[PDB]
Amino acid sequence: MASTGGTKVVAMGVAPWGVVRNRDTLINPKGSFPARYRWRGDPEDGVQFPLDYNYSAFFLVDDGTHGCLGGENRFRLRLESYISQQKTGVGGTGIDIPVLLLLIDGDEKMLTRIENATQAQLPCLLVAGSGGAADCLAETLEDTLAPGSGGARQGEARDRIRRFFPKGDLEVLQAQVERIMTRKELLTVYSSEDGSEEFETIVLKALVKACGEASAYLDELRLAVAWNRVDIAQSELFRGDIQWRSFHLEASLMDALLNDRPEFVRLLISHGLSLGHFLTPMRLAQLYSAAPSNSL
């Protein structure tokens, strides 16, 4: 409603089935109903939360009886791992997609939530100045070897975890944080009052630290092509320690060509490619392979 043009942003609300309280039990033949949800009709506000009419989907998850919020968590981490395996680009070629957890403040369960994300290699994006789970982790990621006082902070982390958690069993709540911090680099802190327009580059900043030397080199500029955002791709190439090599530009122009995106093509040719080492006949056959199937 802010931008009246818009593009009607898409948002999947993965919920558990046993929490939605006004379940009309959608039509058991084949599930094809346009059936409308009853929205305000509830005097209860307990453990019986509704579903919102603002999300484009709702992946309801039927673990067991109507109850706790625990079953859908192992699903999403199984889901977002699959999303990260999926490639992006017309023809299934390009980059592995970027998935990232955004950690606004949570609870005890939110810390053991994002441990699994690191185990499935997800670049968490915790926000500073948030609270319970984020600022408990935000004070630790700035407590590395050079800002910290060596090993004196190993006893200081006893104190700071209690500042955000009055609840008990501090010991594994200490111990799992270093399990997270074994990774330490599939994780970045959104600095408070340092983004909110730079966020789109901070999101970009976290992915390069994540790909930085195994995961199908994301190259930071091949990614801005896949997002179809031109203003990122200029400032990445015009500024920011400009040391772009050959193959950094080579596969970047492929996704500029395979995905349609002609304005990225003029940028790369303006910074110059080979075109005699770029137009190797495999890549032309690669270029014709991304023709649409139902074409002429």
Binding site: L257, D260, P262, E263, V265, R266, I269
Partner: peptide, 10 residues
Amino acid sequence: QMAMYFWEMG
């Protein structure tokens, strides 16, 4: 849009 640009360079 890409056919226009590829014309402009060759």
